[PDB]
Amino acid sequence: NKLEDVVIDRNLLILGKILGEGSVMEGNLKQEDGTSLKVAVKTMIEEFLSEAACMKDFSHPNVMRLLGVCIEMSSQGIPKPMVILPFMKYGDLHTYLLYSRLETGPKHIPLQTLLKFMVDIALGMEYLSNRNFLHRDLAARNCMLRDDMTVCVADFMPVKWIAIESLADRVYTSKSDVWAFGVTMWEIATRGMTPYPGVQNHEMYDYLLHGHRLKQPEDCLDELYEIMYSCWRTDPLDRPTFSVLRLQLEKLLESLP
Amino acid sequence: ELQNKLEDVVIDRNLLILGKILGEGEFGSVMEGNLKQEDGTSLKVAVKTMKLDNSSQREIEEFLSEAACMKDFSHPNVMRLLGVCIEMIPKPMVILPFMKYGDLHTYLLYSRLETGPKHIPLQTLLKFMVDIALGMEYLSNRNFLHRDLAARNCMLRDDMTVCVADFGLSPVKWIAIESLADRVYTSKSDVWAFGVTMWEIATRGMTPYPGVQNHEMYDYLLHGHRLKQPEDCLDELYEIMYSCWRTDPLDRPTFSVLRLQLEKLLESLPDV
Ligand SMILES: Cc1nn(CCO)c2c1-c1cnc(N)c(n1)O[C@H](C)c1c(ccc(F)c1Cl)C(=O)N(C)C2
Numbered sequence A: 001n002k003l004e005d006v007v008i009d010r011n012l013l014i015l016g017k018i019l020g021e022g023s024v025m026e027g028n029l030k031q032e033d034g035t036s037l038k039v040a041v042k043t044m045i046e047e048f049l050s051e052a053a054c055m056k057d058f059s060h061p062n063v064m065r066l067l068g069v070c071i072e073m074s075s076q077g078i079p080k081p082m083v084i085l086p087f088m089k090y091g092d093l094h095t096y097l098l099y100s101r102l103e104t105g106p107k108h109i110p111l112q113t114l115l116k117f118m119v120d121i122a123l124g125m126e127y128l129s130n131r132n133f134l135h136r137d138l139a140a141r142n143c144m145l146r147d148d149m150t151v152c153v154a155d156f157m158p159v160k161w162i163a164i165e166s167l168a169d170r171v172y173t174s175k176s177d178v179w180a181f182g183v184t185m186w187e188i189a190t191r192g193m194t195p196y197p198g199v200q201n202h203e204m205y206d207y208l209l210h211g212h213r214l215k216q217p218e219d220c221l222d223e224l225y226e227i228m229y230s231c232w233r234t235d236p237l238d239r240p241t242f243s244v245l246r247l248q249l250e251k252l253l254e255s256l257p
Numbered sequence B: 001e002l003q004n005k006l007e008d009v010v011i012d013r014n015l016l017i018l019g020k021i022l023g024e025g026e027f028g029s030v031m032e033g034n035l036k037q038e039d040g041t042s043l044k045v046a047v048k049t050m051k052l053d054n055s056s057q058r059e060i061e062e063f064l065s066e067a068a069c070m071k072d073f074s075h076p077n078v079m080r081l082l083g084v085c086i087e088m089i090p091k092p093m094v095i096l097p098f099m100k101y102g103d104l105h106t107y108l109l110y111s112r113l114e115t116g117p118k119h120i121p122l123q124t125l126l127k128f129m130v131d132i133a134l135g136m137e138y139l140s141n142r143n144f145l146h147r148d149l150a151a152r153n154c155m156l157r158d159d160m161t162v163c164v165a166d167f168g169l170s171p172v173k174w175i176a177i178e179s180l181a182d183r184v185y186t187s188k189s190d191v192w193a194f195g196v197t198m199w200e201i202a203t204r205g206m207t208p209y210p211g212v213q214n215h216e217m218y219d220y221l222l223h224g225h226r227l228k229q230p231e232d233c234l235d236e237l238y239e240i241m242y243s244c245w246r247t248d249p250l251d252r253p254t255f256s257v258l259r260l261q262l263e264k265l266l267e268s269l270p271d272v
């Protein structure tokens, strides 16, 4: 019943072209009501189905839902698991931010829309943290845009998103996700800049050990920078929870004319 | 002849003191250093070590011949070569004037951070483009192919003027359509990389072709797709960078035409 409900019948799925390369493909899923739903299919044993059953029960507007898991049985009898996800035409937030800086792309993103993106991700992360679920790969590239332009957290090495204590040890907590969130806020405020310009991935731990953090973007309100800086406090216990973060962002968005 | 090309660029190894690494790689490292001049004083230098294929003397032959050209370069918007030092298995080292302000690409990214340089106005962005176009025009006049033109390879002098550097001594998103297909290369291929460099400056350090992967580039270009106009970019400035990417290399303007188009555009703007 646990792994049975998460597994989707393979003949309900039709695969299409590659979206990105495990490989990600577009697809069609036949639903209970007779209609077909557009899906994204991520190609990846019994323990995998347990964590997939965990993600399947997540139900929050700022969190991507897992529709199910398809087992592809090869001609040589070897199984291949596939993660079935809802298809989001607008793609990832990182790419969206960069296109916004081009004339053919979306319009110049105003500060009110940049903040609502942060609020969206914070509500999603607050939801996951309450469920005691770790993201472990939070970044603008893993935040997806819904058809109504609201942001959802998804896809739950990236050295420049990893908290100082996680680089030293192998330790990962909700406060490590809070650090990655701070970096994600910086990615949105700079409209897609790669973190730490002029710093190489191999110099990152020493740079962080010496107390250097991501610098304040040029057109960033001091209040906004205070919120992202609070995410990178050396001691994880000094970093705020996603719940504190979410409200600070909502109140900052409220204060803007 | 092998010692003749050496003699014209060679600097005695004991005149050079090596310091800390400024940049590292696979095919060599860059270090800061001190070079003792003939007038007794010492000059701050950048030292580029290059691991060449020593199975034949063809790579050192190619290196020394390029260094002979590089030593005679005399233009304010072109980095001069101070000389060549040999670490002895022979290991050649390129000696360059030290530029504390670093590269243009890193400068552009820093300008977008409150603590870094102030917001670069359009006039100063265009002035950078003019400086590179003057440097590239000087190179093209001497029939010297750069082959690695990018903002990351443009250096700022102490007076904040830009100079063309590196000169491809030996990446996909800077390579002209004809150079991707066949190993073919001309000054017109350098004109393509210049248009890509103009785009980097106008976007203040964005990576070219957001959303497009390096392996998709040839196919993307062959379908007539080009770098998109930055949001705040003048149509007139975009016309200039677009002309650099015409499918046929013969349709692309020379560096001399480009330089004047950018200088005239810069003059048409207020002093503010
Ligand atoms: C239509 C499309 N174009 N592009 C490229 C431009 O963004 C993408 C999608 C897409 C749409 N819908 C999905 N559910 C989906 N992907 O899910 C992926 C598994 C996915 C990523 C990336 C980050 C991430 F969070 C996730 Cl969930 C991915 O692999 N992509 C290729 C992103």
Ligand SMILES: Cc1nn(CCO)c2c1-c1cnc(N)c(n1)O[C@H](C)c1c(ccc(F)c1Cl)C(=O)N(C)C2
Pocket (backbone or CB within 6 Å): B022, B023, B030, B046, B047, B048, B096, B097, B098, B099, B100, B101, B102, B103, B106, B152, B153, B154, B155, B165, B166
């Ligand atoms: C002081 C410093 N900090 N940084 C890092 C921030 O830019 C650099 C330098 C530096 C200064 N002066 C030079 N002549 C010099 N390098 O020469 C290098 C051989 C060089 C590059 C890069 C591009 C390029 F065109 C050249 Cl000529 C390089 O390797 N760097 C590490 C750049």
